[PDB]
Design a protein around this ligand. Structure first.
Ligand SMILES: [Mg+2]
Ligand SMILES: [Mg+2]
Ligand SMILES: [Mg+2]
Ligand SMILES: [Mg+2]
Ligand SMILES: [Mg+2]
Ligand SMILES: [Mg+2]
Ligand SMILES: [Mg+2]
Ligand SMILES: [Mg+2]
Ligand SMILES: [Mg+2]
Ligand SMILES: [Mg+2]
Ligand SMILES: [Mg+2]
Ligand SMILES: [Mg+2]
Ligand SMILES: [Mg+2]
Ligand SMILES: [Mg+2]
Ligand SMILES: [Mg+2]
Ligand SMILES: [Mg+2]
Ligand SMILES: [Mg+2]
Ligand SMILES: [Mg+2]
Ligand SMILES: [Mg+2]
Ligand SMILES: [Mg+2]
Ligand SMILES: [Mg+2]
Ligand SMILES: [Mg+2]
Ligand SMILES: [Mg+2]
Ligand SMILES: [Mg+2]
Ligand SMILES: [Mg+2]
Ligand SMILES: [Mg+2]
Ligand SMILES: [Mg+2]
Ligand SMILES: [Mg+2]
Ligand SMILES: [Mg+2]
Ligand SMILES: [Mg+2]
Ligand SMILES: [Mg+2]
Ligand SMILES: [Mg+2]
Ligand SMILES: [Mg+2]
Ligand SMILES: [Mg+2]
Ligand SMILES: [Mg+2]
Ligand SMILES: [Mg+2]
Lengths: 200, 98, 203, 52, 148, 53
RNA sequence: UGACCUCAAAUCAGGUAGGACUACCCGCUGAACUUAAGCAUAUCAAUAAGCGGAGGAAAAGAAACCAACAGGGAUUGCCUCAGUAGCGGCGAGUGAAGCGGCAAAAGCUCAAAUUUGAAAUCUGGCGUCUUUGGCGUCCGAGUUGUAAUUUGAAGAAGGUAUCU
RNA sequence: GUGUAAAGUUCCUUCGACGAGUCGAGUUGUUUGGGAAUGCAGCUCUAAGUGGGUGGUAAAUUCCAUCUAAAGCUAAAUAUUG
């Protein structure tokens, strides 16, 4: 059962696995039908775009801080800054997210600029609008017309300025301060109460 | 700004320009209102005290703060809730001394 | 109004007044049939909270359900297996007594849709529940824009499928890490995690 | 069983390699003749015709 | 292809290459990793030492995103400079104007100090650096700027 | 109420606000929520409570 | 002489449920063969058999969520995370989730509020009409609360510049 | 079209009701990757109002973060030996 110099394997096939085998023979068929559904959805509402305008948000965690991606909807504050009510915004191709907020100014400003760019290209028809004007428009792809763009990494030339303390020493001191903050604060509190209680 | 600007230590992280956030109304959930304060005071008059709450009051009157807390934790379940219940039963006693 | 007072007073279940009322009503409910029709909610505020309206087509049943665990119904306690499966006593039903109440009431009034239910009273042998049901064939329900939804056939015997509040509670249908196994259905999640997905161009 | 392997992956660059090799081989008269095409009366390969 | 397998060559020979004495059987020795401490000890001890037992402390709910910190050495640091402008930078770099290398924006958490740098000032932006990596960067007249 | 509404509909034909033609009603208040709210706002002068609720 | 409450009867007026099918779906109940080279925890497997309930999909679903970031943002599925953290006579075995890329995207409704200068609400009978219904009228339901108004993202009550 | 109606938009003030034998706790059984206890269920106890839940090592003290349960509806992407 165990023989030779081989890696030890974990092949989880001790249940009735063959009753739950999903083979994707329909990958191409689903691709084609998905494309047809997409054409039907587009042709139903043309020239109104099929995609709602989405915000741009930083990805969470220390691993994806650097990246920025499309969010779910614009915050109520962001829509407030451009003078659009969320109920109204949902009817002109703008997505709303009541859950997200803006702790910082950078994402808020990016999304306000994005909303103002979309708002400048918007043309809202009405009863007085005739089919000649409506036919003068093409159904654009909002996901491509207002793409999510990564901020460029800093590159190019800058003056070299060397601090006296090295970066490695700074990191070590930060680690040490964090590691001993609690015990140092407890020690200082005890010292202060001792030398200001008996010094009463 | 608000973060240290470096990846280690106390208050680590990237500095950003802070923007003041309008508080959500859902965060007001624990707040009390005039309506609920009023209704709860009358219901206390109509309903009265529970059997374990009368037992708690006797222990507090007999100077058993340590005894009352052990009972209140045994009844309510957690130490945090027992502390609030004993404080509430002392205020009931404090309102019966006039 | 008075519903706030009713709400605050039912939370004082160990007060003298509420204890007296519970004694009297427990005796009276025990003196009736196991399942009987209630002419009105005994807790109008609690019924309101759970979607009941004083309209034609809203019905209340009171039901009495035996307390305790689920004894294994094997003859003479012999399980015929491995010692890990030899338990007969101290075994528990996976549904609540509230769900059993709802299902028996829905079985009795098979022409109605079980809207919801609530606890009313208790003794050592029984728990007592009141079940709010809705008549889907009554025009006061069919023309009600807030209650048309339960006329659609996907809500047939929703209490038998665990779609009431008690049923969704017993199914583990909640958000978060504490409900990883049962968030979207336990058996669906298990089937998804035990399926061998093979593509045309194998990776 | 249906979960037998049916489709086979080929590296994209190698597939392009082979496509280029086949296009190049289409201009070799000996290869086109061994391939079985009745091309003996075509004066030169590649055979390029006008856009009409 | 089945036509290339030795099953096609064993046709006509009684035992199909399994032996007349051994007699290919269902599961002699057990299934899987059975008997790893009893009759397959000689195999696991020889080829997989350390297999049995516990070492170290558990970590309930380990999120690997916390430990994301890809390394880049110093001999690979100038590959992050734009290829079309590397040669100009290698010539005209000075203390007054040196290329900035944003290592985090390229997907790296720590700068390590293997290899040799061009004797050319650079500004390296990193989350973490090693002691020797920063000593080598400063020696060519550069600097390490901590970011987060 | 039907007769009062008929009179008010006659009055709105004349161009009046229909509030001048009908006097301010002085009646008995009922309804448990309504009466509880009236008591809480110090508006009830007298409350009669049934003994067999 | 009449209300009310509770409880009955009628071949009362009008309705509704049951049963079938099995591939998928929502639950309950529930093994053992088998693997561990024996075997009892474990494994098979939260599977088979058994029971209840649906639909064209079902279920889930607009956070009492994930996170610990410079923060994401209903649900579902795929790829990945990952045969990983972990669980395990720590043996045989087993084993998710967050992030990330994508498919598809859609949001909302009650209870808790005095209409109180007017139960403004609704089933039914009768009549009539242009009949998936409208109008008129009369009983009934309903104040132990049917409408309008609000749902936390808010919102209400006053004042408010006027605009769309 | 009965639009002196209905709805939204700016600012100020006073307020801002928000689900109980439920949450939560103990114990028992089952289950889970959930490990001083992941969910579910039985029994016993049984709340509060900036309270309550969660923050994957039990406990007390001090903070912080994040949602807002115990009521309800909802297409699509997903499944499909009928
Ligand atoms: Mg192993
Ligand atoms: Mg946040
Ligand atoms: Mg709060
Ligand atoms: Mg009791
Ligand atoms: Mg058995
Ligand atoms: Mg031979
Ligand atoms: Mg032979
Ligand atoms: Mg051989
Ligand atoms: Mg032989
Ligand atoms: Mg031999
Ligand atoms: Mg052999
Ligand atoms: Mg009849
Ligand atoms: Mg049937
Ligand atoms: Mg079983
Ligand atoms: Mg088998
Ligand atoms: Mg065996
Ligand atoms: Mg054997
Ligand atoms: Mg045996
Ligand atoms: Mg199992
Ligand atoms: Mg079965
Ligand atoms: Mg059908
Ligand atoms: Mg579909
Ligand atoms: Mg559905
Ligand atoms: Mg909400
Ligand atoms: Mg999500
Ligand atoms: Mg398992
Ligand atoms: Mg994603
Ligand atoms: Mg009528
Ligand atoms: Mg709530
Ligand atoms: Mg079981
Ligand atoms: Mg447990
Ligand atoms: Mg329990
Ligand atoms: Mg909800
Ligand atoms: Mg639903
Ligand atoms: Mg298929
Ligand atoms: Mg089919």
């Amino acid at each position: 059962a165990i023989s030779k110099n081989l890696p030890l394997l974990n092949n989880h096939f001790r249940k009735h696995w063959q009753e739950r085998v999903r083979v994707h023979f329909d990958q191409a068929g689903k691709k084609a039908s998905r494309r047809q559904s997409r054409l039907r959805k587009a042709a139903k509402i043309a020239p109104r775009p099929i995609d709602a305008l989405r915000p741009v948000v930083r990805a969470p965690t220390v691993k994806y801080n650097r990246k920025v991606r499309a969010g779910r909807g614009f915050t109520l504050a962001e829509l407030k800054a451009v003078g659009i009510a969320p109920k109204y915004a949902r009817t002109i191709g703008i997505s709303v997210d009541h859950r997200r907020q803006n702790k910082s100014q950078e994402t808020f400003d990016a999304n306000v600029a994005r909303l103002q760019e979309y708002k400048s290209k918007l043309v809202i028809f009405d009863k007085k609008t005739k089919a000649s004007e409506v036919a003068s428009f093409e159904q654009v792809d909002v996901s491509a017309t207002f793409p999510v763009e990564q901020p460029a990494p800093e590159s190019g030339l800058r003056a070299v300025e060397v601090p006296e303390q090295t970066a490695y020493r700074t990191l070590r001191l930060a680690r040490n301060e964090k590691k001993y903050k609690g015990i140092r604060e407890k020690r200082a509190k005890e010292k202060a109460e001792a030398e200001a209680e008996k010094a009463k | 700004m608000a973060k240290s600007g470096i990846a280690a230590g106390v208050n680590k992280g990237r500095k950003t320009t802070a923007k003041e956030v309008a508080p959500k109304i859902s965060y007001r959930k624990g707040a009390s209102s005039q309506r609920t304060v009023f209704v709860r005071s009358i219901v206390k008059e109509v309903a009265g005290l529970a059997p374990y709450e009368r037992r708690l009051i006797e222990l507090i009157r007999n100077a058993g703060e340590k005894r009352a807390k052990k009972l209140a934790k045994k009844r309510l379940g957690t130490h945090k809730r027992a502390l609030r219940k004993v404080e509430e039963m002392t205020q009931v006693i404090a309102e019966s001394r006039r | 109004g008075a519903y706030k007072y009713l709400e605050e007073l039912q939370r004082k279940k160990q007060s003298d007044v509420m204890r007296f009322l519970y004694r009297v009503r427990c005796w009276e409910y025990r003196q009736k049939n196991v399942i009987h029709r209630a002419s009105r909610p005994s807790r109008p505020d609690k019924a309101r909270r759970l979607g009941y309206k004083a309209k034609q087509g809203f019905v209340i049943y009171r039901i009495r359900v035996r307390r305790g665990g689920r004894k294994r119904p094997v003859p003479k306690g012999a399980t015929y297996g491995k010692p890990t499966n030899q338990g007969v006593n101290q075994l528990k039903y996976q549904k609540s007594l509230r769900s059993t109440a709802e299902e028996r009431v829905g079985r009795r009034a098979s022409n109605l849709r079980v809207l919801n239910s609530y606890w009313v009273n208790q003794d050592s042998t029984y728990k007592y529940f009141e079940v709010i049901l809705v008549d889907p064939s009554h025009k006061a329900i069919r023309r009600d824009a807030r209650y048309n939804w339960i006329v659609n056939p996907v809500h047939k015997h929703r209490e038998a499928r665990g779609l009431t509040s008690a049923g969704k509670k017993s199914r583990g249908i909640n958000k978060g890490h504490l409900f990883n196994k049962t968030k979207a259905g336990r058996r669906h999640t298990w089937k998804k995690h035990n399926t061998l997905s093979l593509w045309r161009y194998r990776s | 069983k249906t979960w037998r392997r049916w489709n086979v992956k080929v590296n994209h660059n190698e597939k392009r390699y082979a496509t280029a090799s086949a296009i190049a081989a289409s201009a070799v008269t000996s290869l086109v003749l061994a391939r079985g095409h009745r091309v003996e009366q075509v004066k030169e390969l590649p055979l390029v015709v006008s856009n009409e | 292809p089945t036509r290339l397998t030795k099953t096609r060559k064993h046709r006509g020979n009684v035992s199909a290459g399994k032996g007349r004495i051994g007699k290919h059987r269902k599961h002699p020795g057990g299934r899987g990793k059975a008997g790893g401490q009893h009759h397959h000890r000689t195999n696991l001890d020889k080829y997989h030492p350390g297999y049995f037992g516990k070492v170290g402390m558990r970590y309930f709910h380990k999120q690997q995103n916390h430990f994301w910190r890809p390394e880049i050495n110093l001999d690979k640091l100038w590959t992050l400079v734009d290829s079309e402008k590397k040669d100009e930078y290698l010539s005209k770099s000075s203390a007054s104007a040196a290329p900035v290398i944003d290592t985090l924006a390229h997907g790296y958490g720590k700068v390590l100090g293997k290899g040799r740098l061009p004797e050319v000032p650079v500004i390296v932006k990193a989350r973490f650096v090693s002691k020797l990596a920063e000593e080598k960067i400063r020696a060519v007249g550069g600097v390490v700027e901590l970011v987060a | 109420k039907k007769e009062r509404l008929t009179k008010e509909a006659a009055a709105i034909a004349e161009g009046k606000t229909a509030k001048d033609v009908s006097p301010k009603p002085v009646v008995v208040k009922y309804g448990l929520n309504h009466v509880v709210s009236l008591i809480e706002n110090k508006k009830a002068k007298l409350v009669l409570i049934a003994n067999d609720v």
